[PDB]
């Protein structure tokens, strides 16, 4: 399903995302827009790894999909748990990734389309 922008804003605010590892709500909204386009079932199969769900979490380092060579399962979850309408597993796993990296550099979509920009538009009007 698609999680509307302002719904996602409220979900992340009510989960303590503002200030989390120095990040902002706008950072995460812009991240989602450029990674999954707000789709809980977003999916990219790059070949050596697959990315799952609203935060495009990676089967090489963070979730087990049973079909990625050279993998570790840093979030100790099946990737299929990141393809559901329930964002709890996504939130827990994304927080662990961002805590590991002390920020959002794991997400190229955020580096390329968000970092160092005016992100007002992502968080206004809710
Ligand atoms: Cl909730
Ligand atoms: Cl807040
Ligand atoms: Cl960051
Ligand atoms: Cl708001």
Sheet containing 57-58, strands listed edge to edge, beginning at the edge strand earlier in sequence: 43-45, 50-52, 57-58
Neighbours of 19 (CB within 10 A): 9
**Chain breaks in the chain following residues, C–N > 2.5 Å:** none
Give yes or no for a contact between 104 and 17, defined as CB atoms under 8 angstroms apart: no
Q: Which ligand is nearest to the CA of 8?
A: 1
Domain map (residue ranges) of the chain: 1-126
Site of tokens 């920020």: 103
Element housing 97 (H / E): helix 88-101
Query: What are the residue ranges of helices labelled H in 18-86?
Result: 25-35
Measure 10 CA to ligand 3 centroid, in angstroms. Answer: 20
- Separation between Cα atoms, residue 68 and residue 41, nearest integer Å: 19
**Pairing mode, strands 57-58 and 50-52:** antiparallel
d(CA 52, CA 92): 14
Tell me the structure's resolution in angstroms, rounded to a single decimal: 1.5
> Which ligand lies nearest to the CA atom of residue 13 in the structure?
2
At the topology level, CATH places domain 1-126 in Lysozyme (1.10.530)
Among residues 7, 80, 81, 75, the alpha carbon closest in space to that of 38 is found at 7
108 vs 68: CA distance, rounded Å: 20
* Residues 75, 53, 38, 10, CA torsion sign: negative
Spacing, Cα 16 to ligand 2 middle (Å): 7
**Residues in the 5 Å CB sphere of ion ligand 3:** 103-104
- Taking alpha carbons only, the member of 53, 81, 55, 77 closest to residue 64 is 77
Relative to the alpha carbon of 11, which ligand is closest?
A: 1
Question: Which are the catalytic amino acids?
Answer: 35, 51
């Amino acid at each position: 399903e698609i999680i509307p922008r302002c719904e996602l804003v409220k979900i992340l605010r009510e989960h303590g995302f503002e200030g989390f590892e120095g990040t902002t709500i706008a950072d995460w909204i812009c991240l989602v827009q450029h990674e999954s386009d707000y789709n809980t079932e977003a999916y990219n199969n790059n070949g050596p790894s697959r990315d799952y769900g609203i935060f495009q979490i990676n089967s090489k380092y963070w979730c087990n999909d049973g079909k990625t060579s050279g993998a570790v399962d840093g979030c100790h979850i099946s990737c299929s748990e990141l393809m559901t309408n329930d964002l709890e597993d996504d939130i827990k796993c994304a927080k662990k990734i961002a805590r590991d990296a002390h920020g959002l550099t794991p997400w190229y979509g955020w580096k390329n389309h968000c970092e160092g920009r005016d992100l007002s538009s992502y968080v206004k009007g809710c």
